[PDB]
Amino acid sequence: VLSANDKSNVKAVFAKIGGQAGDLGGEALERLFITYPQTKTYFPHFDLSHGSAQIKGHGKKVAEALVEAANHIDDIAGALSKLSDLHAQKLRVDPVNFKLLGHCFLVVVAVHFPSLLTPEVHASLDKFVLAVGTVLTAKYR
């Protein structure tokens, strides 16, 4: 589990940039699709054209789930209950792809908030996005 220190780092991050989190999610998703094009095949029902409102809408939702997880960081499983059955049971998302999206989130944080993303904060955020990915794929293990 995330340490007390990691939890505080996550809350410090989202308490600062929570207002922008929606936009950051859109960019993270845009970056996922362009950097790792294989991930687009999970979205054949989307308009995946660059700029697309559906990508932006959906990235916004991804970031809002992260924010929910931050706000209820002591029980992320609880917070993200429906979402977990969705990703592992319904969608069968390959677990490798969660690390790719989590990495894109870090990249967006680095682009816009370089002095926020110290090595310590980078460590805590990496643990956080992995903890979320693990929750979402829990039925696999």
Partner: protein, 146 residues
């Protein structure tokens, strides 16, 4: 691997402009902080017992510079990456026994470091090109296997 004119430009431009000393030190320090089992390979480097200690460690800083300089050797001949890393592959695989997944992790860290250094100039396409590059490098280092 095939490189487009656009990918070559994105790679060469970022390389020219990157602070090799500072970004190299940053990449290595973050590897050791974010993925702490990697510290096992660096026991001759002295104090790695905290994030502060790692980041201030002169051996970490000097080695980080060497590492990013080596990624520079990939930049300078993008169609000869396999050959450029053959000797380093022997080192990392046969002598040091570094599992190749760690080459992926260092690549990801470098991408994050470049993103921080360049801000919005590190566009999604720039990221794509650089992730492709670090993956090619990792592939070239992980050869003396399979």
């Amino acid at each position: 691997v095939h490189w487009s004119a656009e990918e070559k430009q994105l790679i060469t431009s970022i390389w020219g402009k990157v602070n090799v000393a500072d970004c190299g030190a940053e990449a290595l320090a973050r590897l050791l902080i974010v993925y702490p089992w990697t510290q096992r390979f660096f026991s001759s480097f002295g104090n790695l017992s905290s994030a502060t200690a790692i980041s201030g460690n002169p051996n970490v800083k000097a080695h980080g510079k060497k590492v990013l300089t080596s990624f520079g050797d990939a930049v300078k001949n993008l169609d000869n990456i396999k050959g450029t890393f053959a000797q380093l592959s022997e080192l990392h695989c046969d002598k040091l026994h570094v599992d190749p997944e760690n080459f992926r992790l260092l690549g990801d860290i470098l991408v994050i470091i470049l993103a921080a250094h360049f801000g919005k100039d590190f566009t999604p396409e720039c990221q794509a090109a650089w992730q492709k590059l670090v993956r090619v490098v990792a592939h070239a280092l992980a050869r003396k296997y399979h």
